[PDB]
Design an enzyme around this catalytic site. Structure first.
Site, PDB file in Angstrom:
ATOM      1  N   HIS A  41       2.002  13.933  -8.419  1.00  0.00           N
ATOM      2  CA  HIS A  41       1.955  13.925  -7.109  1.00  0.00           C
ATOM      3  C   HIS A  41       3.230  14.207  -6.400  1.00  0.00           C
ATOM      4  CE1 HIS A  41       2.320   9.437  -6.404  1.00  0.00           C
ATOM      5  NE2 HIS A  41       3.234   9.583  -6.048  1.00  0.00           N
ATOM      6  N   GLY A 143       8.508   4.970  -2.004  1.00  0.00           N
ATOM      7  CA  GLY A 143       9.428   5.530  -2.946  1.00  0.00           C
ATOM      8  C   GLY A 143       9.362   4.971  -4.287  1.00  0.00           C
ATOM      9  N   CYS A 145       6.884   4.998  -6.523  1.00  0.00           N
ATOM     10  CA  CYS A 145       6.312   5.916  -7.521  1.00  0.00           C
ATOM     11  C   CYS A 145       7.082   6.251  -8.339  1.00  0.00           C
ATOM     12  CB  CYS A 145       5.555   6.869  -6.618  1.00  0.00           C
ATOM     13  SG  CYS A 145       4.351   6.457  -5.515  1.00  0.00           S
TER      14      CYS A 145
HETATM   15  C1  LIG Z   1       5.132   6.133  -4.055  1.00  0.00           C
HETATM   16  N1  LIG Z   1       6.196   6.584  -3.783  1.00  0.00           N
HETATM   17  C2  LIG Z   1       4.133   5.540  -2.595  1.00  0.00           C
HETATM   18  N2  LIG Z   1       2.823   6.097  -3.034  1.00  0.00           N
HETATM   19  C3  LIG Z   1       2.261   7.490  -2.864  1.00  0.00           C
HETATM   20  O1  LIG Z   1       2.773   8.305  -2.273  1.00  0.00           O
HETATM   21  C4  LIG Z   1       0.667   7.402  -3.417  1.00  0.00           C
HETATM   22  C5  LIG Z   1       0.334   8.731  -3.977  1.00  0.00           C
HETATM   23  C6  LIG Z   1      -0.209   9.753  -2.848  1.00  0.00           C
HETATM   24  C7  LIG Z   1      -0.249   8.836  -1.603  1.00  0.00           C
HETATM   25  N3  LIG Z   1      -0.036   7.526  -2.174  1.00  0.00           N
HETATM   26  C8  LIG Z   1      -0.449   6.302  -1.681  1.00  0.00           C
HETATM   27  O2  LIG Z   1       0.024   5.243  -2.355  1.00  0.00           O
HETATM   28  C9  LIG Z   1      -1.485   6.152  -0.420  1.00  0.00           C
HETATM   29  N4  LIG Z   1      -2.508   5.560  -1.136  1.00  0.00           N
HETATM   30  C10 LIG Z   1      -3.894   6.270  -0.969  1.00  0.00           C
HETATM   31  O3  LIG Z   1      -4.000   7.443  -0.584  1.00  0.00           O
HETATM   32  C11 LIG Z   1      -5.159   5.411  -1.798  1.00  0.00           C
HETATM   33  F1  LIG Z   1      -5.575   4.532  -0.978  1.00  0.00           F
HETATM   34  F2  LIG Z   1      -4.661   4.720  -2.867  1.00  0.00           F
HETATM   35  F3  LIG Z   1      -6.073   6.449  -2.211  1.00  0.00           F
HETATM   36  C12 LIG Z   1      -0.950   5.182   0.526  1.00  0.00           C
HETATM   37  C13 LIG Z   1       0.745   5.199   0.607  1.00  0.00           C
HETATM   38  C14 LIG Z   1      -1.326   6.001   2.127  1.00  0.00           C
HETATM   39  C15 LIG Z   1      -1.364   3.726   0.801  1.00  0.00           C
HETATM   40  C16 LIG Z   1      -1.023   9.169  -3.991  1.00  0.00           C
HETATM   41  C17 LIG Z   1      -2.433   8.534  -3.836  1.00  0.00           C
HETATM   42  C18 LIG Z   1      -1.119  10.244  -5.199  1.00  0.00           C
HETATM   43  C19 LIG Z   1       3.809   4.123  -2.570  1.00  0.00           C
HETATM   44  C20 LIG Z   1       3.397   3.347  -3.677  1.00  0.00           C
HETATM   45  N5  LIG Z   1       3.307   1.851  -3.592  1.00  0.00           N
HETATM   46  C21 LIG Z   1       3.460   1.441  -2.403  1.00  0.00           C
HETATM   47  C22 LIG Z   1       3.646   2.304  -1.159  1.00  0.00           C
HETATM   48  F4  LIG Z   1       4.104   1.577  -0.155  1.00  0.00           F
HETATM   49  C23 LIG Z   1       3.904   3.527  -1.306  1.00  0.00           C
END
Ligand SMILES: *C(=N)[C@@H](NC(=O)[C@@H]1[C@@H]2[C@H](CN1C(=O)[C@@H](NC(=O)C(F)(F)F)C(C)(C)C)C2(C)C)c1cncc(F)c1
Ligand SMILES: *C(=N)[C@@H](NC(=O)[C@@H]1[C@@H]2[C@H](CN1C(=O)[C@@H](NC(=O)C(F)(F)F)C(C)(C)C)C2(C)C)c1cncc(F)c1
Lengths: 306, 306
Positions: A41, A143, A145
């Site tokens: 992603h 960040g 991820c």
């Molecule tokens: C990592 N850098 C960050 N996570 C992401 O960007 C993920 C990636 C995109 C959007 N995302 C999410 O984690 C979102 N979750 C969802 O859309 C879900 F509920 F899981 F379906 C958000 C950030 C809106 C909760 C993907 C789903 C591929 C990240 C990771 N861990 C914690 C963070 F605060 C942010």
């Protein structure tokens, strides 16, 4: 003595963490030999994440669209491909710090260390369990991820997890290092949610044995129980079934403490039905389920890594 | 989101861990530049430990009595001296992995990461707090002596702790890296015991703020309290006094959550008097006091190290 939620020493993994930037998105990649692994992603824009066609999105990318930062040294991307939900960025330099490693997929109930990372820079390390529902209760900010989960056996790093996303309950979902999600999660912006979890019974039993080894004995009793009768109680308290293989796996801890596994089950049964009456076990007022029998043996016997 | 008892990435410290053998005693040393630091009780026999005269014991030692193993490479000891309760073994090789480092002594209530080590081999990493009574609730087995505690600020390792001994309650006592014990403990075989501990109030408040940041709000209330009235409650529950400086230190967390520090104190007051009524905070049924305000800001904002 003592019992701590202990992670593996992270150095071997720290040497593999890089920063991957694509467009305005920066996340972490795992640099092993001449490949950098990162969540696919990374190629997605905010609107892409709504309903992404990753094959379409990736065919429109070039090697030069990926900036890989290994510390303060840029790596030249010379190839890219997608493997399930991870990107494999071929780079022109093999990581000289590549440890001996394996890509393993773990089971719910197993534990691993997470090296939480931001901009390719390790921030902290902590121990996780893979929940029965294939989420992990991690600590991840934006960040993070591409941060990876791993275990170390002697000198070999078994990578088992790479972080992809946070679910609405604040728990985390990710893939193995082949890019296959743990659990029924997808790297797109759906309303997906963790779904129901259970407590990892064999781990709680392991932790009770750790407690006994560390001198917490108040929850012991002369009672015993049968596996079936225990599992009747387990099911009602949303604990997952205890199998004979779990009993066998607890053998060494049972032998070390002299407490038969089924006797510990009887103790757990009492703890589930009575609670803990204001007392604690290993500094917890909750039954802890994120230590495997292995983790307990490792920490209550003393194995190292090199 | 999420909140984990997070340690610093241990790699920088892993590269300093060596094995020090003197006689039949093997323990860990910390190899920085051309000096290896280890507990001076390495020179002691079992009977020496009864009432050791370390100056006498050390004058009877030679450089060749110290074997230093850096991985699978022996280091030649070319000098030895005692600094308080640590030995300084001068070796003929400067550690090429020496990080930027400082020897800092921490305060009770502050936290650090421990790289638990055996035979100079790192085994695991975990986060500790220095208890008000100058013990730490570590996880240490035989051979762990000389494992070190540390913090990392950007690229500099602040070593603050080296493990010397386990007290009878299963808690741990050690020195700073100048060899000065934390607390009223000595590296000899007395009946010494931890002595009374308190709960680190400012840390509990910090952790409550971490909870709010992570969506745990059930313990909040419209109530407030005065610092003096809170401290009257703190004292009765064996919590240590909250100072205005603690309040100031909690400012940023208070600003981020919009919960005034004294309002959080009122919540803590209620939690102390009522308990938690079967609910949990950040996965704990106990008030957690081993996260400093700094730890909370770091983990609920996102700082890295390099
Ligand atoms: C990592 N850098 C960050 N996570 C992401 O960007 C993920 C990636 C995109 C959007 N995302 C999410 O984690 C979102 N979750 C969802 O859309 C879900 F509920 F899981 F379906 C958000 C950030 C809106 C909760 C993907 C789903 C591929 C990240 C990771 N861990 C914690 C963070 F605060 C942010
Ligand atoms: C480290 N390798 C080992 N600890 C020691 O050898 C310390 C050293 C000698 C004896 N000792 C102890 O920890 C003992 N404690 C006491 O005598 C005390 F109660 F603290 F006074 C034992 C092991 C009997 C509890 C010194 C006191 C200088 C070690 C460290 N941590 C945990 C272990 F299981 C063993």
């Amino acid at each position: 003595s003592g019992f701590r939620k202990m992670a593996f020493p992270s150095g071997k993994v720290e040497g593999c963490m890089v920063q991957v930037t694509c467009g305005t998105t920066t996340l972490n990649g795992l640099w092993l030999d001449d490949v950098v692994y990162c969540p696919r992603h990374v190629i997605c824009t905010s609107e892409d994440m709504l309903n992404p066609n990753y094959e379409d999105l990736l065919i429109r990318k070039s090697n030069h669209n990926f900036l890989v930062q290994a510390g303060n040294v840029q790596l030249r991307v010379i190839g890219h491909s997608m493997q399930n939900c991870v990107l494999k960025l071929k780079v022109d330099t093999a990581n000289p710090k590549t440890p001996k490693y394996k890509f393993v997929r773990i089971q719910p109930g197993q534990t691993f260390s997470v090296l939480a990372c931001y901009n390719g820079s390790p921030s902290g390390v902590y121990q996780c369990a893979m929940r029965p529902n294939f989420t992990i209760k991690g600590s991840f900010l934006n960040g993070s991820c591409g941060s990876v989960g791993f275990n170390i056996d002697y000198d070999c790093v078994s990578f088992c997890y790479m972080h992809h996303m946070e679910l609405p309950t604040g728990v985390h979902a990710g893939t193995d290092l082949e890019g296959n999600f743990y659990g029924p999660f997808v790297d797109r912006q759906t309303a997906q949610a963790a779904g129901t979890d259970t407590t990892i019974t064999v781990n709680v039993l392991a932790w009770l044995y750790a407690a006994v080894i560390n001198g917490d004995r108040w929850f012991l009793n002369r009672f015993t129980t049968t596996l079936n009768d225990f599992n009747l109680v387990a099911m009602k308290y949303n604990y997952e079934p205890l199998t004979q293989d779990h009993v066998d796996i607890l053998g060494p801890l049972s032998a070390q403490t002299g407490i038969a596994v089924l006797d510990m089950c009887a103790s757990l049964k009492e703890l589930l039905q009575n609670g803990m009456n204001g007392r604690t076990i290993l500094g917890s007022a909750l039954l802890e389920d994120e230590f495997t029998p292995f983790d307990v043996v490792r920490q209550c016997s003393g194995v190292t890594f090199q």
